[PDB]
């Protein structure tokens, strides 16, 4: 049978369930007062206003206190402005595919449909010197940081990549015929890794040999677009969304497949693996988050790794921008380009956006691909 030691026990508990964020080891009660559990009331947080983050940082450390860092970046990566438009007035129509910046950001290295990369001054607006590099097209194009090499990849041309030289002499130093897509290594740049299909090959730049070819058919996710990438500590490889020990030549762990296309990239904090929209771990392989706006996009970071970009690869190509935070993935801003976006590259010193956009409508017979520059953080 019930008593008052069960009714008054249960009278407070359903009164306790209106606590926004309730407690577990509650204080003693008071029946003549209402009951409300301690709400989250922040005082150690920097305020939402920016000028009040400016008065506070004068008498406090760096930012304004706790939670002052991202509140700068929610004001400064949410706006853009066009700088200049770059054409290809040779056939009176523009036919570029891929873009990047140089190792000292003075020239931007476009890539046409004909097979030649064309230099342009970022200040002038005038061609410097083209280069007959490949025959088919240009898909991937990156330099290194020391200013010595250049990797340029072709679509179907019989050597696929071209390890050039940009010191003083223009020549393919080594040559690869097999792999669709290559990349430099992050920390120590003595490694260029290569991958056709689903098989990853570690190469050298000194000798050009297969250092460690790793592939396991027993554990292959077998995607459509594989891109072998290194962690910024240069110890892990993402071949087909699998971690790879470069030390004793064994597989580590496979991830599950969700959208048939994208194999997986690293995040520049060295803590995660970003499969297409699944955000994983590196030591326990659990899931942190899942964003519905990461449906089949390629990611572009800042050089420090503090903001993420997104471009759609849908059929349309990149209806607008996508700007993410590299800490908690709260999205900043999606500013809109009315045309279709193809390639998207930024600086090491974080001031421009090389935007290869598609003039005109969805036409395979007429693709007008101008190049346009965006200034980071200006209305």
């Amino acid at each position: 049978p019930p008593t008052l030691d069960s009714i008054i026990t249960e009278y407070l508990r359903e009164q306790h369930a209106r606590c926004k964020n309730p407690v577990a080891t509650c204080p003693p009660f008071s029946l003549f007062t209402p009951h409300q559990c301690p709400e989250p009331k922040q005082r150690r947080q920097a305020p939402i206003n920016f000028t009040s983050r400016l008065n506070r940082r004068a008498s406090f450390p760096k930012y304004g206190g706790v939670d002052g860092g991202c509140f700068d970046r929610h004001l400064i990566f949410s706006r853009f402005r066009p700088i200049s438009v770059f054409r290809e007035a040779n056939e009176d129509e523009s036919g570029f595919t891929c873009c990047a910046f140089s190792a000292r950001e003075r020239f931007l290295m476009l890539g046409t449909c004909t097979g030649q990369l064309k230099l342009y001054n970022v200040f002038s607006g005038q061609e410097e010197a083209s280069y007959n590099c490949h025959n088919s097209a240009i898909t991937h194009l990156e330099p290194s940081r020391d200013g010595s090499l250049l990797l340029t990849s072709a679509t179907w041309s019989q050597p696929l990549s071209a390890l050039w030289g940009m010191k003083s002499v223009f020549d393919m130093k080594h040559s690869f015929t097999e792999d669709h897509y290559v990349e430099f290594s992050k920390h120590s740049q003595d490694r260029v890794i290569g991958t056709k299909g689903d098989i990853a090959h570690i190469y050298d730049i000194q000798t050009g040999n297969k250092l460690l070819t790793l592939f396991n058919p027993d554990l292959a996710n077998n995607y459509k677009r594989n891109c072998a990438t290194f962690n910024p500590t240069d110890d892990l490889v993402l071949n087909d969304g699998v971690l790879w020990d470069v030390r004793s030549a064994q597989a580590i762990h496979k991830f599950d497949k969700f959208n048939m296309n994208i194999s997986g990239v690293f995040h520049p904090n060295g803590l995660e693996v970003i499969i297409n929209t699944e955000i994983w771990d590196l030591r326990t392989f659990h899931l942190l988050h899942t964003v519905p706006a990461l449906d089949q996009c390629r990611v572009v970071f800042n050089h420090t790794g503090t903001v993420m970009y997104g471009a759609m690869l849908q059929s349309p190509f990149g209806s607008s921008f996508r700007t993410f935070n590299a800490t908690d993935y709260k999205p900043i801003a999606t500013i809109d380009v009315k045309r279709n976006i193809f390639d998207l590259c930024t600086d090491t010193k974080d001031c421009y956006l090389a935007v290869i956009e598609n003039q005109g409508s969805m036409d395979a017979l007429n693709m007008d691909t101008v190049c346009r520059l965006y200034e980071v953080g200006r209305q």
């Binding site: 508990r13 306790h16 369930a17 577990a24």
Partner: protein, 67 residues
Amino acid sequence: IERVSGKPLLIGTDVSLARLQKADVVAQSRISFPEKELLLLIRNHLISKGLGETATVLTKEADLPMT
């Protein structure tokens, strides 16, 4: 939904999952209370319902803060 959360014993209520681990804490909390707040509620009920000739009797068992 029961299996990926804190296992209620097949009671159909508040089927959202954020509202299911609220019910993990509010139910299994350890509510305790002083007896003194309840003994004044007993005496405030007896005087109102016509039979108030033991309100003065309750001076002996415990304190009488209000008349």
